[PDB]
Amino acid sequence: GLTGKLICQTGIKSDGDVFHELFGTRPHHVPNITPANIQGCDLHEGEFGKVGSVVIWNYSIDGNAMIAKEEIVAIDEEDKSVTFKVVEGHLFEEFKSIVFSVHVDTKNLVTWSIDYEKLNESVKDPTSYLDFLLSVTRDIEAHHLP
Ligand SMILES: CC[C@@H](C)C[C@@H](CC)C(C)C
């Protein structure tokens, strides 16, 4: 009853390898490119670009500052995908678990997926994070377009 999945897909005209590796090896540069959305990315454990690294994101939605600590649980170079599992922060006021994945198909299409389990049934499905992820994707595309 508590489980759901949200997905957004959109095209980018910028390079899809550069987009993938932004999130896979350079996530700490994301705040510099989309500062209205994401104000910080600090390495908590491990190393950038390695499975099992843990980062702390400082981000904002509708003018409200929030924090998410995430474990990078998968980086698939072949599929051009990165998966971030939330382990602490604001989102744990609503969810038991929530996982973000970003995939790039370069035959370019960026797909964001949100997999989640709500603490209880009155919790809203986190659709607002799709608007957030589309905004971050559009700022990255604009930055990467020469
Ligand atoms: C939890 C909200 C933001 C900081 C999400 C991040 C995806 C896991 C970010 C890299 C877009």
122 CA to centre of ligand 1 in angstroms: 23
Q: Whose CA is nearest to atom 4 of ligand 1?
A: 57
57 CA to centre of ligand 1 in angstroms: 7
Cβ burial 9-48 (10 Å sphere, 16+ → b, else e): eeebebbbeebbbbbbbebeebbebbeebbeebeeeeeee
Residue type, 76: D
Thinking of the domain 1-146, which architecture would CATH place it in? 2-Layer Sandwich (3.30)
The domain ranges of the chain are 1-146
Residues with CB under 6 A from ligand 1: 30, 38, 57, 59, 68, 70, 84, 100, 136
- Answer whether 108's CB lies under 8 Å from 19's CB: yes
- Interruptions in the chain after residues (C–N over 2.5 Å): 107
Task: Tell me, in Å, the resolution of the deposited structure.
Answer: 1.5
CA angle 114, 77, 88 (to 5 degrees): 35
Q: How was this model experimentally determined?
A: X-ray
